[PDB]
UniProtKB/Swiss-Prot annotation:
Taxonomy of the source species: Eukaryota, Fungi, Dikarya, Ascomycota, Saccharomycotina
Protein's recorded name: Exocyst complex component SEC15
Superkingdom field: Eukaryota
Summary of subunit composition and partner proteins: The exocyst complex is composed of SEC3, SEC5, SEC6, SEC8, SEC10, SEC15, EXO70 and EXO84. Interacts with SEC4.
Subcellular localization, as worded in the UniProt entry: Cytoplasm; Cell membrane
Miscellaneous: Present with 4280 molecules/cell in log phase SD medium.
Family the UniProt entry places it in: Belongs to the SEC15 family.
Disulfide bonds: none
Source organism: Saccharomyces cerevisiae (strain ATCC 204508 / S288c) (Baker's yeast)
Function according to Swiss-Prot or TrEMBL: Component of the exocyst complex involved in the docking of exocytic vesicles with fusion sites on the plasma membrane.
Amino acid sequence: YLAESRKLAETKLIELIDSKISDDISIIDLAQFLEMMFASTLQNLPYSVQTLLIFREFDSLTRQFMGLLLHDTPSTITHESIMNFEVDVNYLESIMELKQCIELLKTQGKDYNEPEIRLRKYSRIRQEDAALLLSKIQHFVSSVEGANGDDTSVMDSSSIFNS
């Protein structure tokens, strides 16, 4: 029964601290929230299963930050904003498979191969991060400072190659 409470303990703390910090430098502050919660407090005990919660929570924060960058990206992408996603997701690649969401999207993705290679060549995350790279996020990266175009090479192959 104590094992059941330990499993449910790591479970409810996993979803708790997971969705707690679920809501650049703010993700680096979330990586500093990954410092204070995981890499300082939880690192003392778990060089184990926080190593599993490097997958079960933190690559589930690359799955969760994946789908956060893959739901529908309104205006958080540009030549600086998605370059700040390199300060978020390629900074999540600072440690070994989390180079996903800043790949093939960080440079104001609004091209045919930026959308279609945001689907087929922005991998290690889910492939919903093309419509949230060049369909919402190139009418929205085109709506962002450092615009690159609301193309149908962007929006059509981003809403088509992904979906």
